[PDB]
Design an enzyme around this catalytic site. Structure first.
Site, PDB file in Angstrom:
ATOM      1  N   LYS A 113       0.850  -1.208   0.000  1.00 44.77           N
ATOM      2  CA  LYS A 113       0.000   0.000   0.000  1.00 44.77           C
ATOM      3  C   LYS A 113       0.890   1.264   0.000  1.00 44.77           C
ATOM      4  O   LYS A 113       0.571   2.184  -0.754  1.00 44.77           O
ATOM      5  CB  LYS A 113      -0.949  -0.013   1.185  1.00 44.77           C
TER       6      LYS A 113
ATOM      7  N   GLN B  33      -5.233  -1.340   9.809  1.00 43.66           N
ATOM      8  CA  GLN B  33      -4.914  -2.635   9.197  1.00 43.66           C
ATOM      9  C   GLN B  33      -5.421  -3.762  10.098  1.00 43.66           C
ATOM     10  O   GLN B  33      -5.293  -3.717  11.301  1.00 43.66           O
ATOM     11  CB  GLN B  33      -3.389  -2.735   9.084  1.00 43.66           C
TER      12      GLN B  33
ATOM     13  N   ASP C 261     -11.383   2.452   3.761  1.00 42.38           N
ATOM     14  CA  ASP C 261     -11.549   0.997   3.622  1.00 42.38           C
ATOM     15  C   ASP C 261     -13.049   0.663   3.611  1.00 42.38           C
ATOM     16  O   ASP C 261     -13.398  -0.497   3.469  1.00 42.38           O
ATOM     17  CB  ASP C 261     -10.783   0.218   4.681  1.00 42.38           C
TER      18      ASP C 261
END
Ligand SMILES: NC(=O)C1=CN([C@@H]2O[C@H](COP(=O)(O)OP(=O)(O)OC[C@H]3O[C@@H](n4cnc5c(N)ncnc54)[C@H](OP(=O)(O)O)[C@@H]3O)[C@@H](O)[C@H]2O)C=CC1
Ligand SMILES: NC(=O)C1=CN([C@@H]2O[C@H](COP(=O)(O)OP(=O)(O)OC[C@H]3O[C@@H](n4cnc5c(N)ncnc54)[C@H](OP(=O)(O)O)[C@@H]3O)[C@@H](O)[C@H]2O)C=CC1
EC number: 1.5.1.5
Lengths: 285, 295
Positions: free
Chosen positions: A55, A99, A124
């Site tokens: 990422k 995450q 996200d």
């Protein structure tokens, strides 16, 4: 003979190049403005470190500034909440994510931490506010989880219209299967969702004109079950690295199929960058 | 060997009697505790006034304190917002709802009004946050919209386990079809969602061991489509002139009942199936919210 391969590495490189040019243009319009993404990690898992590095590499290539915060394994839910609040209030950060999974010695309620993220920065797409807009068909307004987004872009790369197709999603997680069902429904597929309590899974998979598999069970979906001519999207990453579909058999039945690796994986990172660029642009708008 | 009839009038009455007993006991276990519902109305629509009176009378028979706030048609969006904030902040109110549709001479964003309601008090279950929790499997504490909540209770009254059955939901509205899919999915049915763009709808419906129909398309789902032995839940409320009835109209569902009752194992009649459950479901969600506050 075999299905057409949906090459996620190539498709995602095209998306990243378009995003890089959009961010360069935004920088030319407002010199000094810099789209910024933050990634909050708890703990130090080797897989998460590798995925975060992918990422960060994509972000740097496109011209997005990306910050990685890594908290220790002794971190508590209260300490994580503090960092989320800080990111919510930091005006320079346009989008951020946590995450998953969290790697702490303490019990941390993942839903509570995720739902503390401001919905405008939830690139996200995991907050309940974004999930509830997506689940009810309200798409003007929300961030969609990146793996489902990536899967929808792969299905669109076949050129075959989704409306009226029968789609089958195997898996119902918050990260992949549940939002994938919503994307296909609101693109007017008729959708079946299967999970570990489904009976006769082979018969349900065989109904799929579009089949998205996200179970984390290696090569569990047998090629024999695939409907001839189906479009097969395999989100599995199982350790050789293999997907959730038995690829060599399914490629002889499907029309289009994603390989593993190089299918859904790269598309998910491209879609997170697309959402991050949108979060920066909304901020400017 | 025709279907067993799921009598919504009798089942709702039993549910309301049980809720009354629960509320009496909570009030005796915790003296002074007063489960409380508020209903906020804008304007003075006759239909709304009728529905609100039914909900208030049901709450008071159970022992729930129900407050009705009726704002005039000249109310602005900021005024409705201030009332929602006050009800969010009122620690005596455990659940509240906004009666829709709003009746104002001014433009008011209904979606923003509803999404201002605190999720912990959204007893009608339509805020996006509550919808997001329900859609992602948080059934232990979210609120469920009343019509699908009453559909599930009727399915569970059959005594047939839901897990592993193939369930078909026809319709995907915010009020009924979409939350119904989530309830069946998180009760471990394999669920197929159908809608106006479904091809071969009859073939899809015939796969349903459990079928919930909520389309507003009167008697579109024919008996022949029903899988033999299915559980058939019909949410439709469709009026059709019929001079042989007291009031000159009959109510029919979205399923052709006369033929579907010969195929199904269990079926909801219309009228008298899903309909009578809806107020009992709102009272059940209000008691759930009061219990969560109490804890
Ligand atoms: N490339 C990427 O960046 C990403 C890859 N993935 C990969 O996707 C796969 C799934 O991930 P994720 O969705 O988080 O996984 P989860 O483990 O959270 O969920 C897996 C789902 O598959 C279901 N399932 C498990 N076994 C069966 C079975 N035998 N039959 C039918 N359904 C079954 C589960 O059912 P139930 O709900 O009943 O438990 C659950 O819904 C993984 O391999 C993950 O690594 C995911 C995200 C991103
Ligand atoms: N008893 C009660 O208190 C309640 C009764 N109801 C009754 O339930 C029924 C549906 O209500 P509601 O869900 O609010 O209605 P909506 O009109 O909002 O939704 C109708 C749903 O049915 C689908 N549909 C329409 N035509 C067809 C078709 N020909 N084939 C397949 N699907 C189709 C629509 O598809 P698409 O999404 O593609 O447009 C939509 O998903 C109504 O009769 C309503 O009166 C509802 C709420 C409460």
């Amino acid at each position: 003979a075999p299905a057409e391969i949906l090459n996620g590495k190539e498709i995602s490189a095209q998306i990243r190049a378009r995003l890089k040019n959009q961010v360069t243009q935004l920088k030319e319009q407002v010199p000094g403005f810099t789209p910024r993404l933050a990634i909050l990690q708890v703990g130090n898992r080797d897989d998460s470190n590798l995925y975060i590095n992918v990422k960060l590499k994509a972000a740097e290539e496109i011209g997005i500034k990306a910050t990685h915060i890594k908290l220790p394994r002794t971190t508590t839910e209260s300490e994580v909440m503090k960092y989320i609040t800080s990111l919510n209030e930091d005006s320079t950060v346009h989008g951020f994510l946590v995450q998953l999974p969290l790697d702490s010695e303490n019990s941390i309620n993942t839903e509570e931490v995720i739902n503390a993220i401001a919905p405008e920065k939830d690139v996200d797409g995991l907050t309940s506010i974004n999930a509830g807009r997506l689940a009810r068909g309200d798409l003007n307004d929300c961030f969609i989880p990146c793996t489902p987004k990536g899967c929808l872009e792969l299905i669109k790369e076949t050129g075959v219209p989704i409306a009226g197709r029968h789609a089958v999603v195997v898996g119902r997680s918050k990260i992949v299967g549940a939002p994938m069902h919503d994307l296909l429904l609101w693109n007017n597929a008729t959708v079946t969702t299967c999970h570990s309590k489904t009976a006769h899974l082979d018969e349900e998979v065989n109904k799929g004109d579009i089949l998205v598999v996200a179970t984390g069970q290696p090569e569990m979906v047998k090629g024999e079950w695939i409907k001839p001519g189906a479009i097969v999207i395999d989100c599995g990453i199982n350790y050789k690295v293999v997907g959730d579909v038995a690829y060599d058999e399914a490629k002889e039945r499907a029309s289009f199929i994603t390989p593993v690796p190089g299918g859904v994986g790269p598309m998910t990172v491209a879609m997170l960058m697309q959402s991050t660029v949108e979060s920066a642009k909304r901020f400017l708008e």
